[PDB]
Design a protein around this ligand. Structure first.
Ligand SMILES: Nc1nc2c(c(=O)[nH]1)N[C@@H](CNc1ccc(C(=O)N[C@@H](CCC(=O)O)C(=O)O)cc1)CN2
Ligand SMILES: Nc1nc2c(c(=O)[nH]1)N[C@@H](CNc1ccc(C(=O)N[C@@H](CCC(=O)O)C(=O)O)cc1)CN2
Ligand code: NA
Ligand code: NA
Lengths: 369, 369
């Protein structure tokens, strides 16, 4: 078979939105944090054009929360990330690389400061919950760690602002990027952040009152018709163009923040303790020997399922292509590659095999646009 | 909406066997430890009948290892589990429930004792590696923790013994259940355990020398025609009939081992140090308020994708059905359910609404067969 079906089970968790999206045209799934995440609603290029011009409602429930509350909750959150949260404020979100004893990436969540003693870690695809539980047990921290009943619905695209203002009024229009607050829908208060995994604008509703969230989802579709609302999901083209990086795809637990472009989030000259601070000082002094870069490849199609080596002019491996797609903007294939320091330079040439032919590419900066 | 395609990416990791199985009729995948695990090679019933009669070779590379080595390794491994490993022997495997600060299940791995200071933890679907790393950081344990390059291939079914003897000769016939040793294939030594996720007999080859394991895979198909060898995968029907439990399906991180039938593996009266030991003591003294039980249901079809409530005659929830299938042995649907203390007794009747029919069922003992 060309395509393979996904085998559902309790373990591949469904979401509060599954039954809806399956009547709205979902065509493919991925699995993210042991949960169904839509991967396509038909054509990826059509979804991309629609996202950049209208507004979409997304089931991103698979962006699970790790809730850490209690006396030592701030310190435990800080312990896991190289980002300095000492001046963090309630009502703000923070992109926080989580690192291990080697200084290597575990996850790249968004952290929400709900209170000094209550934090939500909105995670990429790894079981941060068990990292946090292990750390807390070993450090004898006085915290409570749970995966709360939170199921994010995102509203993304340039008409997200107009749609959300229609539903919630003027107060939501004051919400700054990466801020959050609480908004009433039909008597129920929901936490809503201005965030999401696109650079096309919008919001993430952190649904705790599940039935009210399901009704809000339906209401967004009913009153969003004038904005050409449609279902959607994180878009491969958009996210590669925007260089929105994906744990497990572009970087993994063998990479450190300096190999990923996370330099601005590694706080080494402050007094905070975090895992691997250690080794991260050593890595920053010497400099990385590999780094994520963009590539352009002159061909019109690709289906990347895993890493592909890229090669030099002497057929020595000089990097690894990790994410890729056809970009209508460039009218060629673009992608994200971990490249050796020999071939870093924007415009450096390389060779790659697609099917059984050697095809030329060039290295470029991120983001692409 | 009926079946949905899986969307492949680097993050949904492929295995050393992917290219082979995709020429051998794989039709459906699940995701297990962020890795492709085959779910079907066409009809599940036909796969079931074949496994019960003959022999299958399985890609179960998604059964990842956590390797913990060094001076404090034995201690860290024991810290994670309620099972007493104090008299553990090199060359043996042990079923070892992994427990958190609440006494709840994180994973139900098989632990292989390679040396006093080298342990492999063969895991179910959760990121045990990060639990280990967290604990090790807090305790400042002198350990190395890695996910090694190990990609299990299983050989399962009543003809597995004869096929393996064919390849490896008499000495493999000496291997006892849950034992392992090293066996030469074409000059490469492979760790082989008598284990696997069926009750139909066989082995798991812990392939480290990937190229050699791939050659072995091919060789088993070539020499296994005598035994009607075929490809396959863990089988829903067989595993429910055999009462083999799956983390994330039958039990999860809100359940403790006394709710799951793991009592024999919980060591409370020895001197071992592990997480939640106090709380398991508290919990054992009250007794569980819910437990896993078997059910039989009077219909011939089901497609279970999540928990389904099961009811008494006056419409109160008495439990949650978590895994189910049609069983050709029973000529009816069977399953595994978390049932409330009020309604455990074998033979207790219940009702379940499936679409337009209320269907009768009853509670029963595990295992079924
Ligand atoms: N809830 C929420 N949770 C998340 C994601 C999200 O999407 N929203 N995405 C995954 C984690 N990855 C990212 C990647 C990028 C961003 C993001 O939005 N980044 C801004 C960072 C802004 C900043 O640095 O302050 C950027 O322009 O790069 C957020 C999460 C999983 N967790
Ligand atoms: N490598 C290996 N690793 C594993 C699995 C496996 O399948 N093999 N399976 C997953 C964990 N679950 C199980 C469930 C049952 C068994 C099993 O085999 N149980 C015997 C227990 C025998 C004993 O306790 O000694 C039984 O008959 O119930 C093994 C792993 C993930 N890790
Ligand atoms: Na989701
Ligand atoms: Na696998």
């Amino acid at each position: 078979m060309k395509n393979f079906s996904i085998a559902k089970s309790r373990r591949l968790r469904s979401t509060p939105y599954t039954s809806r999206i399956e009547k709205q045209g979902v065509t493919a799934y991925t699995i993210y944090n042991h949960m169904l995440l839509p991967a396509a609603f038909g054509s990826i290029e059509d979804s991309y054009k629609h996202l950049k011009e209208h507004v979409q409602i997304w089931d991103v429930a698979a962006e699970r929360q790790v809730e850490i509350s209690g006396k030592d909750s701030a310190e435990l959150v800080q312990l896991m990330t190289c980002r300095d949260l000492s001046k963090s404020k309630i009502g703000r979100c923070y992109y926080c690389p989580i690192i291990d004893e080697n200084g290597n990436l575990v996850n790249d969540p968004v952290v929400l400061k709900l209170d000094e003693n209550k934090w939500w870690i909105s995670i990429a695809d790894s079981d941060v919950i068990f990292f946090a539980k292990g750390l807390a047990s070993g450090h004898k921290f006085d915290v409570k760690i749970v995966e709360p009943v939170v199921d994010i619905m995102a509203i993304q695209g340039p008409k997200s602002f107009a749609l959300m203002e229609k539903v919630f009024g003027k107060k939501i229009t004051e919400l700054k990027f990466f801020g959050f607050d609480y908004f009433d829908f039909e008597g129920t208060k929901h936490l809503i952040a201005r965030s999401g995994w696109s650079k096309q604008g919008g919001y993430e509703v952190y649904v705790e009152n599940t039935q009210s969230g399901q009704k809000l989802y339906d209401h967004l579709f009913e009153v969003g018709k004038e904005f050409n609302v449609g279902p959607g999901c994180p878009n491969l083209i958009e996210r590669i163009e925007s260089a929105l990086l994906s744990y497990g795809n572009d970087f993994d637990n063998n990479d450190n923040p300096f190999e990923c472009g996370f330099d601005q989030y590694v706080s080494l000259d402050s007094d905070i303790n975090f895992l691997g601070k250690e080794k991260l000082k050593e890595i920053k002094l010497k400099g990385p020997q590999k780094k994520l870069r963009g590539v352009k490849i002159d061909i019109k199609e690709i289906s990347l399922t895993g890493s592909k080596n890229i090669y030099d002019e002497n057929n020595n491996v000089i990097g690894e292509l990790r994410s890729a797609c056809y970009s209508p903007h460039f009218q060629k294939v673009i992608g994200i590659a971990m490249i050796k320091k020999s071939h870093w330079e924007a415009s450096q040439g390389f060779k790659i095999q697609i099917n059984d032919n050697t095809i030329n590419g060039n290295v470029c900066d991120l983001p692409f646009i």
